[PDB]
Design a protein around this ligand. Sequence first.
Ligand SMILES: Nc1ncnc2c1ncn2[C@@H]1O[C@H](COP(=O)(O)OP(=O)(O)O)[C@@H](O)[C@H]1O
Ligand SMILES: CC1=C([C@@H](O)c2ccc(F)c(F)c2)[C@@H](c2cccc(O)c2)NC(=S)N1C
Ligand SMILES: [Mg+2]
Length: 333
Amino acid sequence: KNIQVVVRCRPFNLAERKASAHSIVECDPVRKEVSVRTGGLADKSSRKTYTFDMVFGASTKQIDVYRSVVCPILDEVIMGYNCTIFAYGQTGTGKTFTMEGERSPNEEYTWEEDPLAGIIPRTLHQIFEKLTDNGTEFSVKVSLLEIYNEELFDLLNPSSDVSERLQMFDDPRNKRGVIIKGLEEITVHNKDEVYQILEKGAAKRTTAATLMNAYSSRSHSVFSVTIHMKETTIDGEELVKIGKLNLVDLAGSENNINQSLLTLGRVITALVERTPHVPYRESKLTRILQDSLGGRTRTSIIATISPASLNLEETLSTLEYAHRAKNILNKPE
Ligand SMILES: Nc1ncnc2c1ncn2[C@@H]1O[C@H](COP(=O)(O)OP(=O)(O)O)[C@@H](O)[C@H]1O
Ligand SMILES: CC1=C([C@@H](O)c2ccc(F)c(F)c2)[C@@H](c2cccc(O)c2)NC(=S)N1C
Ligand SMILES: [Mg+2]
């Protein structure tokens, strides 16, 4: 059962406008195609065209990404499945904008209603909405694990400082599992604890950037939500569902020496080519997210691209890579 792959294109920034930049990317949601002009000046041109599961043009708002993509995934998490969403693409294209989002300028909005909010805040807010009074006891735990230069950092632990590296081990109980020694899990007791926890992440990320070269565009971040659910029947019997969601903001795809990013590409090649050895263990990212690539997790990829012709080759590289990823078959619960 194929993983889901969608492609989003960012809008032009203020610099590009003043330069009066023409888009090289046309998105057609009805067709679900992305079309890229690869040459030709105005009146005759060649293009490359790709169809994906969904396609979001440069005007798409965060709420549309949320309703289309994440909403049906979060329902699946609540049914006790595991899900993963990846953001993939060149630095500058909106991976962090999508996964996290931004604050509207000028304190116009509270966080829970900011229209520039991205997947992480919207998901956490919505979990408490969906389960207010339907008869399901639940708790919500989050962790934020990042990988930079094949080392692991905990971005939510307010006790350690970002410098301290974590150790990864195989999980004896679990064949396709790893234990991350020291990784903090924080309990989010209600929707009003959400924002302050995200803020701590952001502050730790600032320290990280100071300490490590090109940190934000070289480190992979895995933000996890675990929802432990319990229902009681009319007969007083307990029913248990556990759902885990990973929101993965990958290192920028552009080109250095990212072993996890190299390994991810090789894991996808092995999977789509049906070759029997898959090199999960050749990097920390793919050991951790093993079950998301051809395993028992439902999995989406959001491939972010740029509308500008300066970014042509890398936009092509991204769509090519996203397009073959479509052939990965996962086996959810
Ligand atoms: N879909 C979008 N809508 C509006 N602005 C965007 C969008 N995508 C990216 N941006 C802007 O583009 C710049 C780079 O995006 P960012 O999330 O940092 O990308 P990345 O994490 O891929 O390097 C940021 O200034 C961001 O505000
Ligand atoms: C805390 C925060 C974001 C949030 O998604 C986030 C940011 C950094 C993290 F390490 C993190 F785990 C979550 C994300 C966000 C969160 C909540 C609302 C919103 O509009 C935007 N973008 C911004 S600017 N901030 C300040
Ligand atoms: Mg980023």
